[PDB]
Amino acid sequence: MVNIKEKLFVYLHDPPDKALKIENHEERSKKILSSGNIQDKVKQADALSSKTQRFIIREPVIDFLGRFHVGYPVFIHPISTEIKRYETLEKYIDLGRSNRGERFVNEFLERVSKLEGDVLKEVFEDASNKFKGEESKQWAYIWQFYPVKLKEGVKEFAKSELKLKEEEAEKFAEEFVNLPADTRFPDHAIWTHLDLTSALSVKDPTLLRIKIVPVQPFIANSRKQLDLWASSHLLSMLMYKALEVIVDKFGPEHVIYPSLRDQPFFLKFYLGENIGDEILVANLPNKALAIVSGKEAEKIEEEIKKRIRDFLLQLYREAVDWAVENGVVKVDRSEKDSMLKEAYLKIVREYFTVSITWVSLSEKEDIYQVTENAGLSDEDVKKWLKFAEKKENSRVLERIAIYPLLVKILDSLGERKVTEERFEKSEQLKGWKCHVCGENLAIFGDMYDHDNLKSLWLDEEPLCPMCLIKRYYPVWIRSKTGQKIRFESVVDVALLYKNWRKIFDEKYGKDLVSKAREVSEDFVKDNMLVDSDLYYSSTWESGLSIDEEKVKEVVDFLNAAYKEIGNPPKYYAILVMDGDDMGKVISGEVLGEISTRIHPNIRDYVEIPEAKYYSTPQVHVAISQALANFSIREVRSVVKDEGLLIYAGGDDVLAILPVDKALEVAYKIRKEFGKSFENGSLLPGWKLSAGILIVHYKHPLYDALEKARDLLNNKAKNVPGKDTLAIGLLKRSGSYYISLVGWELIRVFYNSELRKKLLERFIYHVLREVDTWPIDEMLKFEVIRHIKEETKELREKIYGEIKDLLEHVRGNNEVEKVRGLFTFLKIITDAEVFP
Ligand SMILES: [Mn+2]
Ligand SMILES: [Mn+2]
Ligand SMILES: [Mn+2]
Ligand SMILES: [Mn+2]
Ligand SMILES: [Zn+2]
């Protein structure tokens, strides 16, 4: 139901360069739109936005080209409260004003508006050319690529017409595109404001919350890395199928969370853009927030559920066909027909529960009634409401004025629904269970004895419908995107340690392949080993799936290689990260004081309640965009091809890394999640906790994921103030070493001379002594004990370093701190884990 002209008008009610001049900005919007159409609903949208405002200006103006003017405008990070100044823009504007004054102002404005109009026209043309039939895809394309093409055009304008250097031009454009929407409260960029106006320009706008469950039972129950990735990615695809409805009916700017801008799924499967291996990463969470017209709410709920069910069923059908064709199931046409029986289709149908809930944004009601019935009543909240009541002179208001609490409310309701629908879930047939998961009925399981059931399946491994879908999914992604993950096995990731696989392939690869051929022709496929574990001599020594004792020759060959280039890495690392109190960040209760959000100069001219800063919807959109930038760009940039980044949607991250790269990667992802700005774009100015679990490759994956999630949720997030890294080493021995450590310790230790000496006895004795010991003296004794002019310096320096490191260790008393620090030291200094 998308009409592109009206959408362009209501969207560009304000110009992108509103920050540049506040005076007569509607006129510039009229010029930009003049290329398209002629410049209502926007009034209602503006009023609804105005209801969220928590200020009364006591009239001051902040503007680059203004004439009472209170100075140039800056940008303030919503979470960080860090101030970002438009340096290049400021300089150029100042020099221009100095040289030609007002004439320069009008001429420059006319030029800039001419450029924005041009770019808008070109983009519109591209949209109409690429998507002739469908207006929805057109608007999606325009909304997506407009700020980009604008950035390129402004960069060209600065480089050519203004004769600026490459760096200065890039800065000029990046600062131009990321201008604020309200110079008084530069929490958010102009684009998020445009998005909100367009979203709220619809009749009876309502807030829609979507949740798809279960995440963990589906994901964490994986036996293979490929199955894990498949699970995460399939979940993300389900969320994309859900959001596709919203994008179709309304547009991408209607989705508050997650932000759809630069989303690989949105770009590839909707805008048809050609995408690389970045599509392999799962960037969409299982929770979503959108703005939808009130009349069409239920219809859209049914439509989302319908699309998800249908997609899953088609996926299952294609899966069945694939399985029958490639020999995954050795079956005849009658049985193939039986594979699609109502029971299995029903399993597929009812596995995923989708809870959609909504609340009208513009239906007036008592603020206090809403919050009290909700139970969201703090001392701060009461003041926050009182200010609104006094400002609007009305006790009852549109509930959008209580937007943050509303979201909370919605979440609550959603949660309950999740339970209810789960209670009314039909029991599953009684039968033999899937060999992969062990919780779902296997196909043919109800109809056959276990032996016969085993005979029907490849490698004697019966599959449930969901696991069959899960097995077919990588082929499906390969067909739809031309992409497959670089590392299929967990051993693939483990062997990245010190480039062991590359070095070994280069030196002894062909010989290992040939001797493998000597043992059997099954082990070698496409001149490569069919499985990576065949790189280990142990696999050949014992368990295999007889043959001549030539296998032993291979083994000795491998052992010889191990003598020459070192032993192969049998350990890998699971990195699971999550943001600290993210919900409280979004609601804004943790974020702190409201005063910091205002431009410093107008602090006196504006009246503000003595209460917490609860997030306006534009702030929510801003933060969503920040999380999208982080997950889509930064995390993937850090991991690169050093490992496998399975999932990255907003705050939470899931990746499999080699043991050497794990700590660096985790620390750098945390560092980048710390940054407030990268170029023009925003980043989360916040903190996250993580869990790193080092596991032997033979260990069952589901248990490893369990212990990793355990490390993150029960260890790292249970520390006051959080922001901790929980490192666990689970040796084949069965011994489990856990160390709780602050992020800085990684950097300090990497810088420490202690590391240099350690890499090029002590730790064991320290752990032995701590338990019985009654401490700085106790430490000093041992440091002196294990470590001629040089030695006093080295003892003093390493004791100093240990003293520094102990500070960053998560322990409540020094006994704890030493135990943790030296547990960490035990973890790194393991000859088995770090050859
Ligand atoms: Mn406006
Ligand atoms: Mn306006
Ligand atoms: Mn999270
Ligand atoms: Mn970066
Ligand atoms: Zn299964």
Swiss-Prot record:
It is found in: Cytoplasm. Mn(2+) 1 binds at residues 13-14. One of its GO terms (molecular function) is nucleotide binding. GO terms for cellular component: cytoplasm. Pfam families: Cas10-Cmr2_palm2, Cmr2_hel_dom1, Cmr2_hel_dom2, Cmr2_N, Cmr2_Zn-bd. Mn(2+) 3 binds at residues 578, 651-652. Changing residue 232 to A: No effect on pre-crRNA cleavage. Binds 2 Ca(2+) per subunit, this may not be the physiological cation. It comes from the Archaea. Mn(2+) 2 binds at residues 14, 25. Residues 570-730 form the GGDEF domain. Residues 1-201 are annotated as: Not required for target RNA cleavage. Signal peptide: none annotated. One of its GO terms (biological process) is defense response to virus. Keywords: Antiviral defense, Cytoplasm, Manganese, Metal-binding, Nucleotide-binding, RNA-binding, Zinc. CDD domains: Cas10_III. Mn(2+) 4 binds at residues 634, 672, 678. Part of the type III-B Cmr ribonucleoprotein (RNP) complex, an elongated RNP with Cmr2 and Cmr3 as the base, with Cmr4 and Cmr5 forming a helical core along the mature crRNA (39 or 45 nt in length), while the complex is capped by Cmr6 and Cmr1. The 5' end of the crRNA is bound to Cmr2 and Cmr3, while Cmr6 and a Cmr1 subunit (Cmr1-1 or Cmr1-2) cap the 3' end of the crRNA. Belongs to the CRISPR system Cmr2 family. CRISPR (clustered regularly interspaced short palindromic repeat), is an adaptive immune system that provides protection against mobile genetic elements (viruses, transposable elements and conjugative plasmids). CRISPR clusters contain sequences complementary to antecedent mobile elements and target invading nucleic acids. CRISPR clusters are transcribed and processed into CRISPR RNA (crRNA), formerly called psiRNA (prokaryotic silencing) in this organism. This is CRISPR system Cmr subunit Cmr2. It comes from Pyrococcus furiosus (strain ATCC 43587 / DSM 3638 / JCM 8422 / Vc1).
